[PDB]
Amino acid sequence: PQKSKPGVFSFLDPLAYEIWMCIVFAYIGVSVVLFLVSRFSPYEWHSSESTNEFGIFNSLWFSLGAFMQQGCDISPRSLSGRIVGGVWWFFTLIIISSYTANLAAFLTVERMVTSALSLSNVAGVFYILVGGLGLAMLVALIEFCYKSRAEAKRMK
């Protein structure tokens, strides 16, 4: 019958779903291990302030930045944290290269069940981006409303 155009989430096609779930798990584990090796030791603590800024949220942000090949405002300084960072960097290099080898080809494959990319092949990432902006707006508004109510109760 009719040739099937790639789906709205065809940007996940180059890698298998098993690889995607393993990537999520590896990211979570790397963030947890980085936070652990950074913050667990009381000798890294000075009421008290840590020598580094690698909390759990900051560790997750660092791992996400390293995977997106972007980079953040912090970098591990200890020997143990640097091992985690370097091995995660090597993993990111291999995985991202394998993913981006043939992304454009994966975004336009027609299946029966060179051309420029059209907006229909990237509408999915555009939808996800707008949804993320809306989610961030909702979270910020909720935070402001809760803070205002708390301040009003404090002053009342």
Partner: protein, 188 residues
């Protein structure tokens, strides 16, 4: 200046609302070859397409958003996208959000003691911009299903989105300035 900022924000809000209202209500969204009956140059909008040459010049025909095709092996994603395009839910949502932001900015002038109305107007304006983005993407992607070009109605909506985001930025800046002035008065 506070007066200059208010004038700029109100002017931008009204201009964006007018541009988007024209964009929704006009029939120059796209130029393409087609038939205005039931293959000459045709100018198309959101609901109707009309010819510009030949014996059928000046005749407008409604857009069939659900063509009577073979229909076998049809994913629900295509039907959902076609329904979104036919209803024009996101352009209309952008129109309503822009109008509500305009009412909020009008209300703040008559409710100067209240400061969250300006923040609400800014939120409405940026949400209208995001709605414009989603509606533009939906319309273009639905156009996919060999030479075509867009008229000024589509670019009217583009400028409406840009102006709406700029006006939202200005409104949030006004909110920041009002709260900073309140904090400075409290400190002294």
């Amino acid at each position: 200046d506070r007066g200059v900022q208010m004038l700029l924000t109100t002017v931008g809000a009204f201009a964006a609302f007018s541009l988007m209202t024209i964009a929704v209500g006009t029939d120059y969204w796209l130029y393409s070859r087609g038939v205005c009956k039931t293959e000459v140059m045709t100018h198309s909008g959101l609901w109707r397409t009309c010819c510009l040459e030949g014996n059928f010049k000046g005749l407008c025909k409604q857009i069939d958003h659900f063509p009577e095709d073979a229909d076998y092996e049809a994913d629900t994603a295509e039907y959902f996208l076609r329904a979104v395009r036919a209803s024009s839910i996101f352009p209309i949502l952008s129109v309503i959000l822009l109008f509500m932001g305009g009412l909020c900015i009008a209300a703040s002038e008559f409710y100067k003691t209240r400061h969250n109305i300006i923040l609400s107007a800014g939120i409405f304006f940026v949400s209208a911009g995001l709605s414009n983005i989603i509606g533009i993407i939906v319309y273009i992607s639905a156009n996919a299903g060999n030479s075509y070009s867009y008229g000024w109605s589509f670019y009217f909506g583009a400028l409406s989105f840009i102006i709406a985001e700029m006006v939202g930025v200005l409104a949030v800046h006004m909110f920041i300035d009002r709260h900073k002035q309140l904090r400075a008065t409290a400190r002294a």
